[PDB]
Design a protein around this ligand. Structure first.
Ligand SMILES: [Cl-]
Length: 293
């Protein structure tokens, strides 16, 4: 599994800030747009993209405040990410796309699809966000920690002051051990503690136990859309998983229209770090049948 990031930087200015993105592949077709979540960056897709780039443009932005993107002093609510990503997609002049999405990148991607359904030719997803209606439906192992994250005192001290999202949660969501070179690529955006704001606001935005009500309603809405949408869907899952355990993947195979599920083997949350090759090869094999309208 590769540790390098052999992609030239591209930048676009949106809403007063520079966003960095990967942009590789042919320009004359339907691009594939890869959206990372917390606390990652386009680095998460580094070993997946090379499987797709031979046939399709691959665009992988760093969300505002993350990766190599600028780090304004925002609250970094989901709504802020929504504004930045919508402007990013329009600045690149994207029309129809295929989405490849994970964690908060999946909340952004499903929210944009629901709002632009005619522009989405397929959704590949993994470990995505849906409502977690009560705390008993959050994984028991992670429950105490995420309850602690969702406070103004303890949560800020763990995430911002001590970097828990990078030094504990990230490695704990990968089965295999991350290397120090990989850990340094993920630590880089957040070397200054004050730049860790998005890493704390994100778990405070998760739709758990009805709170916050605005995100619970928005995520309910894109899930209702997704359950009724004929859009082709490709869902990667692992064992034991985190947000999407094997039995939930099986349930979604049945309840989401035109959904293919792929078992990637061992995996927790950051499935891209456990089996990037199968993820990338299965996305590449799935694209051609989406082309025809
Ligand atoms: Cl989060």
């Amino acid at each position: 599994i590769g540790t390098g990031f052999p992609f030239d930087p591209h930048y676009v200015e949106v809403l007063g800030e520079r966003m960095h993105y990967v942009d590789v592949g042919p320009r004359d077709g339907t691009p594939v747009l890869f959206l990372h979540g917390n606390p990652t960056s386009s680095y998460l897709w580094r070993n997946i993209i090379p499987h797709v780039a031979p046939s399709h443009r691959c665009i992988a932005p760093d969300l505002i405040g993350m990766g190599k993107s600028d780090k304004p002093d925002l609250d970094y609510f989901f709504d802020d990410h929504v504004r930045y990503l919508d402007a990013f997609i329009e600045a690149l002049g994207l029309e129809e796309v295929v989405l490849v999405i994970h964690d908060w990148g999946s909340a952004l991607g499903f929210h944009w699809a629901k709002r632009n359904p005619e522009r989405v030719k397929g959704i590949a997803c993994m470990e995505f966000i849906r409502p977690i209606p009560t705390w008993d439906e959050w994984p028991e192992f992670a429950r105490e920690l995420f309850q602690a994250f969702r406070t103004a005192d303890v949560g800020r001290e763990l995430i911002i002051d001590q970097n828990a999202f990078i030094e504990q949660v990230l490695p704990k969501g990968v089965v295999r051990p991350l290397t120090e070179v990989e850990m340094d690529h993920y630590r880089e955006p957040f070397l200054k503690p004050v730049d860790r704001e998005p890493l704390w606001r994100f778990p405070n935005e998760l739709p758990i136990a009805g709170e916050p009500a605005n995100i619970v309603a928005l995520v309910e809405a894109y899930m209702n859309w997704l359950h009724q949408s004929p859009v082709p869907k490709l869902l990667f899952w692992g064992t034991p998983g985190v947000l999407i355990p094997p039995a939930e993947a099986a349930r979604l195979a049945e309840s989401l229209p035109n959904c293919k599920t792929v078992d990637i083997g061992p995996g927790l949350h950051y499935l891209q770090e456990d089996n990037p090759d199968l993820i990338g090869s299965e996305i590449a094999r799935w694209l051609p049948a989406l082309h025809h309208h």
